[PDB]
Amino acid sequence: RSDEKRILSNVAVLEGAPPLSEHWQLFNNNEVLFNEARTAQAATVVFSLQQNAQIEPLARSIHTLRRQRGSAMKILVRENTASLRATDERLLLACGANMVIPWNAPLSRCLTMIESVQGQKFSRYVPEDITTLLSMTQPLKLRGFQKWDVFCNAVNNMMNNPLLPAHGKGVLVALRPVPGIRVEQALTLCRPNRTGDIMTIGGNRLVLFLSFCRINDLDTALNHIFPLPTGDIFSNRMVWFEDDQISAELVQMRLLAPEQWGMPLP
């Protein structure tokens, strides 16, 4: 029947202690724990975080578990060594973890937090593609059309990522089509070939983000993405190439009603 009371945990979480009840099961590492958690349903899964190199493989495992097992499972990250940055915490929580047990919390407090998550159902939306999430902490790996909010999020995660270079992150360009063309039609002509080049449609504008592109190279970039001259497709264009200008424009973009958000044609 139900595995709601079952606790699957890496050995490191109990800091040397044996299983605390008949419900606890211990695993020598996060790989064997994850493989077991794959067959669980409503169980508590407690991964151990030792070093920063484990963040991405852990993000992938949490993501796989949340998407494939559903909302009943409680997925916890026990930070054993002081390593988790605020950005990587945001990533792990967005991938499907209910809670992170920080390093400075002793074993007794760790045990209190494990009991606190019981009966808690995961109600947050988790994106299907892990690259949508990894774009929070890693350079943009998305390409092509993205829904307005997903586009806004990816560009915003890029401006706020402290590991990225301060300069030349790319160019944000909002293109307005000529009277005879709808944005949905202009979108079918928008075919970027580079990873990091994404676009969206909304409020009668085609909005592109071109990674590592200098402002002087914008026309060159646009000539490669479109098979026809951009002057024949679009009447107007608004460009932002400085971090403050891009961030200021993402604020104005986030004000667009979902009824005004466009989607690609079938």
Author numbering: 222 to 487
Sentences from the paper on this structure:
Bacterial cellulose is a widespread biofilm component whose secretion in Gram-negative species requires an inner membrane, c-di-GMP-dependent synthase tandem (BcsAB), an outer membrane porin (BcsC), and various accessory subunits that regulate synthase assembly and function as well as the exopolysaccharide’s chemical composition and mechanical properties. A third cytosolic protein, BcsE, has been shown to significantly boost cellulose secretion in vivo and to present a second c-di-GMP binding module in addition to the BcsAPilZ domain. Crystallographic and solution-based data show that BcsE’s predicted GIL domain is a degenerate receiver-GGDEF domain tandem (BcsEREC*-GGDEF*), where the divergent diguanylate cyclase module binds both dimeric c-di-GMP and BcsQ through mutually independent interfaces. In addition, we reveal that a third N-terminal domain (BcsENTD) determines the protein’s homooligomerization and targeting of BcsERQ to the membrane as well as previously unreported interactions with transcription antitermination complex components. Together, the data suggest that BcsE acts on multiple levels to fine-tune bacterial cellulose secretion, from the early stages of secretion system assembly to the maintenance of a membrane-proximal pool of dimeric c-di-GMP for processive synthase activation.
